[PDB]
Design a protein around this motif. Structure first.
Motif, mmCIF file in Angstrom:
data_model
loop_
_atom_site.group_PDB
_atom_site.id
_atom_site.type_symbol
_atom_site.label_atom_id
_atom_site.label_comp_id
_atom_site.label_asym_id
_atom_site.label_seq_id
_atom_site.Cartn_x
_atom_site.Cartn_y
_atom_site.Cartn_z
ATOM 1 N N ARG A 29 0.870 -1.180 0.000
ATOM 2 C CA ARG A 29 0.000 0.000 0.000
ATOM 3 C C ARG A 29 0.899 1.219 0.000
ATOM 4 N NH1 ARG A 29 -1.510 -3.311 5.013
ATOM 5 N NH2 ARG A 29 0.230 -2.025 5.773
ATOM 6 N N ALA A 30 1.313 1.608 -1.193
ATOM 7 C CA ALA A 30 2.105 2.797 -1.368
ATOM 8 C C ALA A 30 1.925 3.284 -2.785
ATOM 9 C CB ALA A 30 3.563 2.500 -1.103
ATOM 10 N N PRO A 31 2.251 4.556 -3.036
ATOM 11 C CA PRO A 31 2.218 5.057 -4.410
ATOM 12 C C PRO A 31 3.228 4.371 -5.342
ATOM 13 C CG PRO A 31 3.157 6.688 -2.900
ATOM 14 C CD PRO A 31 2.493 5.634 -2.063
ATOM 15 N N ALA A 138 14.163 14.951 -19.091
ATOM 16 C CA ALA A 138 14.988 15.645 -18.100
ATOM 17 C C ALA A 138 14.467 15.661 -16.674
ATOM 18 C CB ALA A 138 15.222 17.073 -18.555
ATOM 19 N N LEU A 139 13.243 15.205 -16.475
ATOM 20 C CA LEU A 139 12.665 15.142 -15.175
ATOM 21 C C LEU A 139 12.847 13.726 -14.634
ATOM 22 C CD1 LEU A 139 9.362 17.189 -15.679
ATOM 23 C CD2 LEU A 139 11.702 18.014 -15.371
ATOM 24 N N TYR A 140 13.113 13.642 -13.348
ATOM 25 C CA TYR A 140 13.196 12.383 -12.627
ATOM 26 C C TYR A 140 12.529 12.653 -11.314
ATOM 27 C CZ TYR A 140 14.743 7.795 -11.377
ATOM 28 O OH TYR A 140 14.729 6.466 -11.037
ATOM 29 N N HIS A 141 11.673 11.731 -10.910
ATOM 30 C CA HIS A 141 10.838 11.813 -9.707
ATOM 31 C C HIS A 141 11.367 10.976 -8.562
ATOM 32 C CE1 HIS A 141 8.215 14.212 -12.149
ATOM 33 N NE2 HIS A 141 8.470 13.346 -13.106
ATOM 34 N N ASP A 142 11.532 11.611 -7.402
ATOM 35 C CA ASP A 142 11.919 10.877 -6.173
ATOM 36 C C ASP A 142 13.272 10.180 -6.342
ATOM 37 O OD1 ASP A 142 9.572 11.579 -4.679
ATOM 38 O OD2 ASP A 142 8.443 9.886 -5.595
ATOM 39 N N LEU A 143 14.282 10.876 -6.852
ATOM 40 C CA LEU A 143 15.628 10.292 -6.951
ATOM 41 C C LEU A 143 16.178 10.146 -5.540
ATOM 42 C CD1 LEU A 143 18.096 9.389 -8.523
ATOM 43 C CD2 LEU A 143 18.866 11.749 -8.485
ATOM 44 N N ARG A 168 -0.668 10.970 -12.585
ATOM 45 C CA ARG A 168 -0.668 11.999 -13.604
ATOM 46 C C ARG A 168 -0.687 13.401 -12.979
ATOM 47 N NH1 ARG A 168 0.608 13.166 -18.979
ATOM 48 N NH2 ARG A 168 -1.160 14.118 -20.100
ATOM 49 N N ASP A 169 -1.301 13.556 -11.812
ATOM 50 C CA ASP A 169 -1.366 14.867 -11.183
ATOM 51 C C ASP A 169 -0.107 15.240 -10.369
ATOM 52 O OD1 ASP A 169 -1.701 13.551 -8.729
ATOM 53 O OD2 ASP A 169 -3.776 14.202 -8.439
ATOM 54 N N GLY A 170 0.862 14.334 -10.277
ATOM 55 C CA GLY A 170 2.096 14.608 -9.584
ATOM 56 C C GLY A 170 1.989 14.697 -8.074
ATOM 57 N N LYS A 171 0.872 14.275 -7.494
ATOM 58 C CA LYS A 171 0.667 14.430 -6.037
ATOM 59 C C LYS A 171 0.934 13.156 -5.208
ATOM 60 C CE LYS A 171 -0.647 18.582 -6.833
ATOM 61 N NZ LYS A 171 0.286 19.672 -6.449
ATOM 62 N N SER A 172 1.450 12.122 -5.862
ATOM 63 C CA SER A 172 1.747 10.862 -5.206
ATOM 64 C C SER A 172 3.246 10.625 -5.083
ATOM 65 C CB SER A 172 1.049 9.729 -5.961
ATOM 66 O OG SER A 172 -0.364 9.891 -5.866
ATOM 67 N N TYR A 173 4.018 11.700 -4.955
ATOM 68 C CA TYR A 173 5.468 11.559 -4.738
ATOM 69 C C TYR A 173 5.739 10.954 -3.345
ATOM 70 C CZ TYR A 173 4.569 15.923 -2.307
ATOM 71 O OH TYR A 173 4.074 16.892 -1.445
ATOM 72 N N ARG A 186 6.602 25.432 -3.476
ATOM 73 C CA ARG A 186 5.979 26.629 -4.051
ATOM 74 C C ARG A 186 5.318 26.317 -5.372
ATOM 75 N NH1 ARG A 186 9.897 29.455 -3.749
ATOM 76 N NH2 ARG A 186 10.693 29.429 -5.905
ATOM 77 N N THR A 187 6.030 25.608 -6.226
ATOM 78 C CA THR A 187 5.562 25.373 -7.577
ATOM 79 C C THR A 187 4.773 24.061 -7.780
ATOM 80 O OG1 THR A 187 7.564 24.263 -8.329
ATOM 81 C CG2 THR A 187 7.585 26.660 -8.384
ATOM 82 N N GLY A 188 5.042 23.029 -6.982
ATOM 83 C CA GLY A 188 4.450 21.723 -7.213
ATOM 84 C C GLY A 188 4.945 20.995 -8.455
ATOM 85 N N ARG A 189 6.061 21.431 -9.037
ATOM 86 C CA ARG A 189 6.564 20.785 -10.250
ATOM 87 C C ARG A 189 8.047 20.418 -10.127
ATOM 88 N NH1 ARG A 189 4.767 21.291 -15.097
ATOM 89 N NH2 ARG A 189 2.562 21.745 -15.533
ATOM 90 N N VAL A 190 8.439 19.313 -10.759
ATOM 91 C CA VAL A 190 9.853 18.965 -10.902
ATOM 92 C C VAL A 190 10.378 19.661 -12.164
ATOM 93 C CG1 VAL A 190 11.442 17.005 -11.329
ATOM 94 C CG2 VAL A 190 9.555 16.750 -9.686
#
Length: 289
Positions: A29-31, A138-143, A168-173, A186-190
């Motif tokens: 049970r995790a993203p 160029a984006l990498y999530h949760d490195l 898709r909404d980027g809120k499950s990091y 501030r931005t919510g974006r990588v």
């Protein structure tokens, strides 16, 4: 070549998403949830199983996966395919049998990771990031250390899974905000620059043998406090000049201002002069069979 898989094929390969096939760090049970499997051609695979409602539009999931599937490089655990049947959203990647940096770095048994091996990880992951950027990812999530994997030859590789968001909404990091770049809240974006910040956190992990929030690493880094910052397990393995140079690189990556952080090519150029024991195989340096 990147391909589609049926859900039946993937259930067969993973023995019905058996919990004990989970190779990721957050449980069932995790993203971010990844299973080991084996296809009928005997290829071992890693299967990332996205949560329900994370990527509800199959077309946009498939197009992202296809895009990532174009990347092929020996510094990556590469993306072999995807599944989008029956509301499932899966990514299928090359299996990495020698587990994660987190295992070897934070949960070592015989001895701490050698300096030369830590530097090799840093270089090879920088090279992976440079490759990804060159191919338009160029984006990498949760490195972090759980995204650095070791292959059959014990060589470090970057997991392809982080090239796509958990949702898709980027809120499950998964990254705790203590470790995220200052502009991310501030931005919510990588951005490419925030990936470099995350590389900074990986450098801190490698230097220290600990997972230290950057804010805490702050005065330590300022004072180049080798006793406090550096892993005691490394004592004797590096010159003060070289240790200090890697600390300085981490400082650059962790700059508040995104534009001051190094670009991927600069990471590579900074890392190359520090490499040691280049002629020694990773099996030997890492201490795996």
């Amino acid at each position: 070549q990147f391909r589609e898989f049926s859900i039946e094929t993937i259930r067969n390969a993973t023995s019905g998403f058996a919990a004990e096939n989970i190779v990721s760090e957050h449980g069932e049970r995790a993203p971010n949830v990844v299973y080991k499997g084996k296809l009928e051609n005997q290829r071992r695979i890693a299967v990332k199983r996205f949560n329900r409602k994370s990527w509800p539009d199959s077309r946009q999931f498939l197009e992202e996966a296809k895009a990532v599937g174009q990347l092929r490089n020996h510094r990556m655990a590469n993306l072999l395919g995807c599944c989008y049947e029956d509301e499932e959203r899966l990514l299928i990647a090359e299996f990495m049998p020698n587990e994660t940096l987190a295992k070897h770095l934070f949960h070592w048994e015989s001895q701490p990771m050698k300096w030369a091996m830590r530097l090799r990880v840093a270089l090879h992951i920088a090279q992976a990031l440079e490759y990804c950027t060159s191919k338009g990812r160029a984006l990498y999530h949760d490195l972090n250390a759980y995204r650095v994997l070791f292959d059959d030859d014990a060589n470090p590789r970057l997991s392809c899974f982080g090239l796509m968001k958990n949702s898709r909404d980027g809120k499950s990091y998964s990254t705790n905000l203590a470790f995220t770049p200052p502009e991310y809240l501030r931005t919510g974006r990588v951005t490419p620059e925030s990936v470099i910040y995350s590389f900074g956190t990986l450098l801190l992990d490698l230097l220290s043998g600990k997972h230290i929030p950057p804010s805490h690493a702050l005065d330590l880094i300022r004072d180049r406090n080798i006793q406090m910052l550096m892993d005691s397990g490394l004592e004797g393995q590096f010159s003060s000049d070289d240790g200090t140079e890697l600390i300085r690189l981490a400082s650059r990556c962790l700059q508040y201002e995104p534009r001051e952080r190094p670009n991927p090519k600069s990471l590579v150029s900074a890392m190359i002069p520090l490499q040691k024991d280049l002629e020694i195989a990773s099996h030997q340096l890492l201490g795996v069979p």
